[PDB]
Ligand binder design. Structure first.
Ligand code: NA
Length: 240
């Protein structure tokens, strides 16, 4: 997250860190949202590589013991069957991860609330992106979980020629684009939390930023629209 602030430890208890095994270590690669005690929602592109993945729930500082983490292996990966890694602009950038164990819920570990199917936010709706991604274009991962205020940019604006044009689809949510605050590499797969009738819900799964940079004016961060995928999500969990 570029232009973020450090999240309070218990603000976003559904955020997870998706990590891969790297030598004798683990490396953060993406975010995710805990949606059942044994299921995480992330971006399909995050699991393109044939790596050993683990999820960390209750994570705050990637580099320090928080005293709240639970570490769990990924047992099964179900990518949207329409995802094409050579075509992120087509959409379908969503995957579900079945965890090897069910995690224990507490003020640091909670299920993310998903929107009702078909919900579309009004332009300029209040949302926060969260994650440990780069804090500058071509920078480094954050140590502590970051949040940035990124209001939505509706489809009609976001798909206009000076924004993303044809690249954005109605199956996506755009947010931000102010040239200061944005998602960045390593935030992919995590949540966009939007405040609706008093409750935050996870409306987005972070998908992409511009090839030119993370915080680029009129290139808002682009997210998979969760409310387009409720039936898919429910079908995968029920059949797995
Ligand atoms: Na930690």
């Amino acid at each position: 997250v570029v232009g973020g602030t450090e999240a309070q430890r218990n603000s976003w208890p559904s955020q997870i860190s998706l990590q891969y095994r790297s030598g004798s270590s683990w490396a953060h690669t993406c975010g995710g949202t805990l949606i059942r005690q044994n299921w995480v929602m992330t971006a399909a592109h995050c699991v393109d590589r044939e790596l050993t993945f683990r999820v960390v729930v209750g994570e705050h500082n990637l580099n320090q013991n928080d005293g709240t983490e639970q570490y769990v292996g990924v047992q099964k990966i179900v990518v949207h069957p329409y995802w094409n890694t050579d075509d992120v602009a087509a959409g379908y950038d969503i995957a579900l991860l079945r965890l090897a164990q069910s995690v224990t819920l507490n003020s640091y570990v909670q299920l993310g609330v998903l929107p009702r199917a078909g919900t579309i936010l009004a332009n300029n709706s209040p949302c926060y992106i969260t994650g440990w991604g780069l804090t500058r274009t071509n920078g480094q991962l954050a140590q502590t979980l970051q949040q940035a205020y990124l209001p939505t940019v509706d489809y009609a604006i976001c798909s206009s020629s000076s924004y993303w044009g044809s690249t954005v689809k109605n199956s996506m949510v755009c947010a931000g684009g102010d040239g200061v605050r944005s998602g960045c590499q390593g935030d992919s797969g995590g949540p966009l939390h939007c405040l609706v009738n008093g409750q935050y819900a996870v409306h987005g799964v972070t998908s992409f930023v511009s090839r030119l940079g993370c915080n680029v004016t009129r290139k808002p961060t682009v997210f998979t629209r969760v409310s387009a995928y409720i039936s898919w999500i429910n079908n995968v969990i029920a059949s797995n």
